[PDB]
Amino acid sequence: SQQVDKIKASYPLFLDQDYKDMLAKKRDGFEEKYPQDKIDEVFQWTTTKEYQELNFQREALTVNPAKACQPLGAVLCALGFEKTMPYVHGSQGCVAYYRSYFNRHFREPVSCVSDSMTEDAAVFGGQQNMKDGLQNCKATYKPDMIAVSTTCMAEVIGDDLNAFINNSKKEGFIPDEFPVPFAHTPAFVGSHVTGWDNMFEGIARYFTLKSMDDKVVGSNKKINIVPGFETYLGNFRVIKRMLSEMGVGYSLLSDPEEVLDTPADGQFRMYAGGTTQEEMKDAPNALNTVLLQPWHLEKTKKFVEGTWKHEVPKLNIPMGLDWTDEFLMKVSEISGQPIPASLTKERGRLVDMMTDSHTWLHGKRFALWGDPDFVMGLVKFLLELGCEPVHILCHNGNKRWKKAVDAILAASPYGKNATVYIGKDLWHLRSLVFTDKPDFMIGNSYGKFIQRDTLHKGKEFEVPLIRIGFPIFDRHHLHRSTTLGYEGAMQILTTLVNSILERLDEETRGMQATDYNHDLVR
């Protein structure tokens, strides 16, 4: 039943008595459900150290992973280039999922095509799909460039992307000069960030490998910036803002901030902004190339150093105070530009905020997960804030990265109780936050199910989620935030300290019970 003046959606409609009784009868009548005492017993067991040890002995089963597959990153990379259509050679189901995943994080259109390979292509290959696909795509959506990656079907059957593209041009399906960079992006290798690296290196190679002979390092007086897999718009914008404030000439290679933020003004813009083909063709002439997320840009680094002859600086992701400091100082050294007073003042405002908030942050215990560069930057900034990152999980991390993070932890007293986990998923993390409870989780929207589980054990065991990362599906417009630079550190610090204070306010809101500590001033 509904009252027309106060219509109820599913919540709280189905808490009405008649819906409750109906659901009780369905359960008792036909679901053959385990008794509630048995559910409570098993639930309690899943929160124990005994369960945790069984959980961490898994070798074959993955539960609630914290990573995606390569082509997702290849699509995001390709979207960063001017009037470029991402094109995934293989089965169309993949592309539907890629678009949906990004649609929900950015709340924006996400353009990507497939060439719809099916059962038959498994026997005779996908050459004809590529010829018709490229022609159809170019004629219909009029891109200036088509950037080709692959689904796992096309990888398993072994389609030769280079040969198929060359034949499409040879047989007249697309003009010979139309740019069709490509990369093999097998879902069973690495993760989505590997797909970004592979796509970018493919695009760099397409525009530079065969024209190196006229290139002179430093001749365009710019610094190349390679952002990697980046899903916060503010992170593209703050890097450009800081470099412009310094007067540093730069080329941001793969820049999707415009196409992921078009205005609602009465027309749909399939393409907007992006790195130009010239910027890629001219990139070898830069003074140097800075990689913003080096732990998933290894292949790009080898190409930039091996072919462009740039001496890629050893720089961490510019997150937090120290690593932003180091990024600016290296940019200053490469470009010969001094760090201006405006960035010095911004640094000091971040430090001022740190002094203002340090008493509420000190000793706060955190579980956190994400991609490798993001995670280690978050770890570094937490240590700078006097926080303890106790559970550090990177599903797509590797041994070398774990050693670097362990060295960062070892250099600080606030890392004494921290452990780094690689190859573990969020069902592993669920056990950790039960058996060694932190104060908060920092992670993506999939963490909301861990918070739900912890609350079911008890309010005193609940671990609230702070949403920082990718994907964020259950809040709006956090993709506009910033996590890099002093600006990003300021935003993260504000989110952390106010999450702490929101939770304290919740715990002290009880009249005549805990509100003796419900302070007006904090």
Binding site: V4, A9, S10, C94, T140, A187
Partner: protein
């Protein structure tokens, strides 16, 4: 728009295509004609998509794992293959359920074998067996496992049927192998069929000779309602108010035991024909159970369906049918009294999957709105037969529409509202056209039944008449 105007639009849009695609797409676009009833005489469907044209379709894994099997709440469903498919589809579809997630229900979790290259080289069958044992130790209250195959499984020659039979016997557990690899078929649709056949072959016959369940003459099953935002619950409450006993829900909020009990019912009530007609046809062949299509979108269709369903039983049910109708009459009449004036005359274009593009027309008409275009991602010709009777004359029909086509049709037709999916939503909002998600209900609903009609009307009103649409143009241009 006039018929001839609509035919010229189709030709205008098709001019951008290369010759091969143009000749193909012309066959998937048509204008409804009341003198033409058989769809096989005016539109083609359920064929391959043209490469590179940005179809909205998914794959057979989406149709099997995401749609049919995934909602079954007390089973664990294994996304068998690389990590991607299970992650993108994790909790994306709002197939609601009651349970303790991680303990006795598992719907919004993502279980996967996370294939690495070694699994490609040596095969994944030993990993799958090891995986099943790990599931058993960590999730003891699961009541069965399904193995949803992603693209590589069939391509490397794995034999999940054999693993499922061997491990099933060793553990005395229902383990369902499903060969729903995404390269099969042309869309989600073949995934429906594959999944229906896996239910039939591996689950549905478990209680064929079992006689334990006490039947009544009023036992029914809801077939093809996946309880999006609770849709199946707002349908079930009505059927049971009418005196029926809903033994099973396929598969929203569904349990494996409910499925196993379905061969015991007297009548199968089919909402989504596309996805479940296969198993409905099977149960009528093997068990003699009749099935009938029904429609709970909006008061007109819900009343019509309740009365048709009741006619299959006796006077006592038909009497209770009229009791339910009279009970809810003031409620939905108040909804139309409030919202129909705010929506009457507004024109709607729809593009959805395999059922809703025709099933929701009645609800729009109950609010005085007009559906001037509709189409399906993956429907077959029997769906289009049913659609032409529902759609008005000279309306536009599009099968497996391309991104380009949909945008160009909208620019010319200028609908007041569009109802489609997440990949379309943000395109048309930027064009200044109110948009409602007609898969996820835009995180609202339910929309089925009398209680859902109130929410449906509220939602269309809030979006169509929202102040934001008057502001797209800056006053200085």
């Amino acid at each position: 728009m006039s018929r001839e105007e609509v035919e010229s639009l189709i030709q205008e849009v098709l001019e951008v295509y290369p010759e091969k695609a143009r000749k193909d797409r012309n066959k998937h676009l048509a204008v409804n004609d009341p003198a033409v009833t058989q769809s096989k005489k005016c539109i083609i469907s359920n064929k391959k998509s043209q490469p590179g044209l940005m179809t909205i379709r998914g794959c057979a894994y989406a149709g099997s794992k995401g749609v049919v099997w995934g909602p079954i709440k007390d089973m664990i469903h294994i996304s068998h293959g690389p990590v991607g498919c299970g992650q993108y589809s994790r909790a994306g579809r709002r197939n609601y359920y009651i349970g303790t997630t991680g303990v006795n229900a598992f719907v919004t979790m993502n279980f996967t074998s996370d294939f690495q290259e070694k699994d490609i080289v040596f095969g994944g069958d030993k990993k799958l067996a090891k995986l099943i044992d790990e599931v058993e130790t960590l999730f003891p209250l699961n009541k069965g496992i399904s193995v949803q195959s992603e693209c590589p499984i069939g391509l490397i020659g794995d034999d999940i049927e054999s693993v499922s039979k061997v491990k099933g016997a060793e553990l005395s557990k229902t383990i369902v192998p499903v060969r729903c690899e995404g390269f099969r078929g042309v869309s989600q649709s073949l995934g429906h069929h594959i999944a229906n056949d896996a239910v039939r072959d591996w689950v549905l016959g478990k209680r064929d000779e079992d006689t334990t369940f006490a039947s009544t003459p009023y036992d029914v099953a809801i077939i093809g309602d996946y309880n999006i935002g609770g849709d199946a619950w707002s349908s079930r409450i009505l059927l049971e108010e009418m005196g029926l006993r809903c033994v099973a829900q396929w598969s929203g909020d569904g349990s494996i035991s409910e499925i196993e009990l379905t061969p015991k019912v007297k009548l199968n009530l089919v909402h989504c024909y596309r996805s479940m007609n296969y198993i409905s046809r099977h149960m009528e062949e093997k068990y003699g159970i009749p099935w009938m299509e029904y429609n709970f979108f909006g008061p007109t269709k819900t009343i019509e369906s309740l009365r048709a369903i009741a006619a299959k039983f006796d006077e006592s049910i038909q009497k209770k049918c009229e009791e339910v109708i009279a009970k809810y009459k003031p409620e939905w009449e108040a909804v139309v009294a409030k919202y129909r004036p705010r929506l009457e005359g507004k024109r709607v274009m729809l593009y959805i999957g395999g059922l809703r593009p025709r099933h929701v027309i009645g609800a729009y008409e109950d609010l005085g709105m007009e559906v001037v275009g509709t189409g399906y991602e993956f429907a077959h010709n029997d769906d289009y037969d049913r659609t032409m009777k529902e759609m008005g004359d000279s309306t536009l029909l599009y099968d497996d529409v391309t991104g380009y086509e949909f945008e160009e049709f909208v620019k010319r037709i200028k609908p007041d509202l569009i109802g489609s999916g997440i990949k379309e939503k943000f395109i048309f909002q930027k064009m200044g056209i109110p948009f409602r998600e007609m898969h996820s209900w835009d995180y609202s609903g339910p929309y089925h039944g009398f209680d859902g009609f109130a929410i449906f009307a509220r939602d269309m009103d809030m979006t169509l008449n929202n102040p934001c649409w008057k502001k797209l143009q800056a006053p200085w241009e």
